[PDB]
Amino acid sequence: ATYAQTLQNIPETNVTTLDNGLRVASEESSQPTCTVGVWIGAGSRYENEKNNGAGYFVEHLAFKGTKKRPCAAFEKEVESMGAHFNGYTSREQTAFYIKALSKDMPKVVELLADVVQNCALEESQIEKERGVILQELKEMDNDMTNVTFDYLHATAFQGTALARTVEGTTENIKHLTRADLASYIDTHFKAPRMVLAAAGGISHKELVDAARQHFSGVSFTYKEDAVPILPRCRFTGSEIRARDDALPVAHVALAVEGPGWADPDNVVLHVANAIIGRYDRTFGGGKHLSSRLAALAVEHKLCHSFQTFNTSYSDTGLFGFHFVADPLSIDDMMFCAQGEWMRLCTSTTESEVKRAKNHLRSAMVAQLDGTTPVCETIGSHLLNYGRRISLEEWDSRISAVDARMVRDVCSKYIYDKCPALAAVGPIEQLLDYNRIRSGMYWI
Amino acid sequence: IPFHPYYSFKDILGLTLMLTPFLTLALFSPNLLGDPENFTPANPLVTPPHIKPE
């Protein structure tokens, strides 16, 4: 049994659209347990200055019970069947999903539909989750890594929809209303923009049947069933420096604008980041790690960790890197990093890519390690690519990447581009955008 | 701020800003500043009327 075959033999992902526009998809395995959920095309990006944070406030009440079955009951009914209910919300994607035995696949589907369609929004609950969210913000404020990425966006997409935090403003959360929340749900949570995805020991048909049964609400006007295209977000080469010598370490993130979900280059871009990779003081590979940056990081104690990323979006993205270092090793670190980006554009080797690829292949495969992760991949590919891309395909696209190709793309997206940078902490040694800008050319 | 490019550039600018008048003088009005008395070979038997330094 060869990798090649094990791929072809992976069951297909069934996709059928109901009448109201909702899409039901799923991957059936011989597993007794499963994961089903609805992945929505909503999020902070879809918010505005006045309702920024609603989608998150909503996330906080999605589980506090619906109208048909209030808090106590809703909770009790789920716990008692051993099901796990989780969910999240990003800038361009929200989702609620459940983990339970395939045997309850339908009762689950019912629950889901009841959550997205009939959230309680009990006036009394709101005022409580309001105090709660307010607390979550203070705790998250102490997580430099996310405070940084937020700032990164804040400036990389400054002045636009994407420049907003998923959680939202302090004011916004202090004043949002039963109304605004209701409105958000009734405006965004709609069939054509939703996907009921599932994976495990489920029958597509048993699923799609149970789907037609609880996801009814048919639309009348043409407006109701066309998916609204968002106004574009403008990238801006710029920097934001939140200094505080009182923090023990410094955080730095640098990025150029990304291509966006649909673009094929994204594959090569990922193949690229596979070369630079990532490090963190607990990798035992140490000085022998294959990643040049990681080595230098070790050889010269350049940092505590670092990661490359290719955060994609519908019409844009962020391709860059982030690293945590001590106040006095920020510069060398940055210097070396930008060096590697330059190496990508001008002197990548076949040897490098060959490996990067295998690392990437193993990566995609591991992204589907369980039911939740698979369901999460289905819920996403549809929402973003409009269909499902099977490992069999991914692999072919990845296998086709060669040095000469990695070079061209990276050059196309990195070389001589004005980057967006965010620094937090004791960042005095890292300095001058100008200097950083010139680290954007000549190997 | 790092000297370069901020001041390397700023100084190269200040170099041309001054260098212009210098050259303008040196080239258009060459002896604007020199005593014409120095176009006469030194002669110990003729004290100039007004001996003054540069």
Resolution of this deposited model, Å: 3.2
Structural domains in chain A (count): 2
Domain check: are A362 and A427 in the same one?
yes
Q: Does A431 touch chain B (CB under 8 A)?
A: yes
Q: Tokens at residue B52, please?
A: 């003054």
Q: Which residue of A has its CA nearest to B2?
A: A432
HSE-CB for A188 with a 13 A CA cutoff:
28
What residues contact residue A3 under an 8 Å CB cut-off, 6+ apart? none
Cα A175 to chain centroid distance, Å, stands at 28
**Number of CB atoms found within 10 A of residue A178's CB:** 14
Distance (Å, whole) CA A359 – CA A419: 27
Number of neighbours of residue A321 by Cβ within 10 angstroms? 21
Q: Is A59 a catalytic residue?
A: yes
Q: Where are the beta strands (DSSP E) in A132-238?
A: 194-200
CA distance A365 to A394: 10
How far away is chain A from the Cα of B18, in angstroms, using its nearest Cα?
A: 27
Domain end (from A197, A226, A255): A226
CA distance A262 to A62: 30
Instruction: Give the amino acid at A83.
Output: A
DSSP secondary structure string for all residues of A346-411: HH--HHHHHHHHHHHHHHHHHTTSSHHHHHHHHHHHHHHHSS---HHHHHHHHHT--HHHHHHHHH
Size of chain A in residues = 443
Yes or no: say if A34 and A105 are a contact pair by the CB < 8 Å rule: yes
Q: What is the CATH number of the domain that holds A138?
A: 3.30.830.10
Residue A274 belongs to what H/E stretch? helix A265-276
Cβ A380 vs Cβ A93: under 8 Å: yes
Residues A220 and A261 grouped into a single domain: no
Query: Is A268 a member of any domain?
Result: yes
DSSP state of A102: G
Domain check: are A154 and A284 in the same one? no
The answer to whether A434 faces chain B, any CB pair under 8 Å, is yes
Chains A & B: contacts with CB separation below 8 Å: 9
Same-domain check for residues A94 and A156: yes
Question: Based on the domain organization, do A26 and A169 belong to the same domain?
Answer: yes
Residues A196 and A288 in one domain: no
Residue A2 lies inside a defined structural domain of this protein: no
Same domain as A299, residue A180: no
In this structure, are A150 and A208 located in the same domain? yes
Of A226, A261, A276, which marks where a domain is finished? Answer: A226
CB contact under 8 A, A431 and B6: no
Domain boundary among the residues A169, A196, A226 is at A226
Q: Helix or strand or coil: residue B50?
A: coil
- The whole-angstrom separation of Cα A269 and Cα A365 is 18
State whether residue A428 sits within 8 Å of chain B by CB. no
User: Nearest CA to CA, how far is A150 from chain B (Å)?
Assistant: 26
CB atoms within 10 A of CB A244: 11
Asked whether the beta carbons of A278 and A267 are under 8 A apart, the reply is no
Can you give the residue range of the structural domain that contains A348? 238-441
Helix (H, G, I), strand (E, B) or coil at A198: strand
What is the CB neighbour count within 10 angstroms for residue A266? Answer: 19
Q: B1 in contact with A at a CB cutoff of 8 Å? A: yes
Q: Provide the shortest C-alpha distance from residue B14 to chain A (in Å).
A: 20
What residue type is assigned to position A3 of the chain?
Answer: Y
Query: In this structure, is residue A36 part of a structural domain?
Result: yes
* Whole-number Å distance between alpha carbons of B6 and A171: 41
CB proximity B6 to A under 8 Å = yes
A432 touches chain B (CB under 8 A): yes
One domain, residues A317 and A396: yes
CA neighbor of A345 nearest in space, from A237, A417, A254: A417
Flag whether A3 is in a domain.
Answer: no
Q: Do A374 and A311 share a structural domain?
A: yes
B5/A431 touch (CB, cutoff 8 Å), yes or no: no
The reply to whether A5 falls in a domain is no
DSSP letters, A280-346, are: ETT-TTGGG-S-HHHHHHHHTT--SEEEEEEEE-SS-EEEEEEEEE-TTTHHHHHHHHHHHHHHHHH
The Cα of A389 is separated from the nearest Cα of chain B by a number of Å equal to 48
Classify residue A132: in a domain, yes or no: yes
Say which of A27, A28, A47, A59 is annotated catalytic: A59
Q: Which of A431, A435, A437 to mutate to test the interface with B (most CBs of B within 10 A)?
A: A435
Do residues A292 and A274 touch, judged by C-beta distance below 8 A? no
Structural domain contains residue A353? yes
| Cross-chain Cβ contact A431/B1 below 8 Å | yes
Same domain, A347 and A207: no
Residue A7 inside a domain? The answer is: no
A56 and A189 housed in the same domain: yes
Nearest C-alpha in B relative to A434? B5
Nearest-Cα distance to chain A for B53, in Å, is: 49
The approach used to solve this structure was X-ray
Residue among B1, B3, B8, B10 with most chain A CBs within 10 A, to mutate: B1
Distance of CA A81 to the CA centre of its chain: 30
Choose from A430, A431, A432, A436 for mutation: most chain B CBs within 10 A: A432
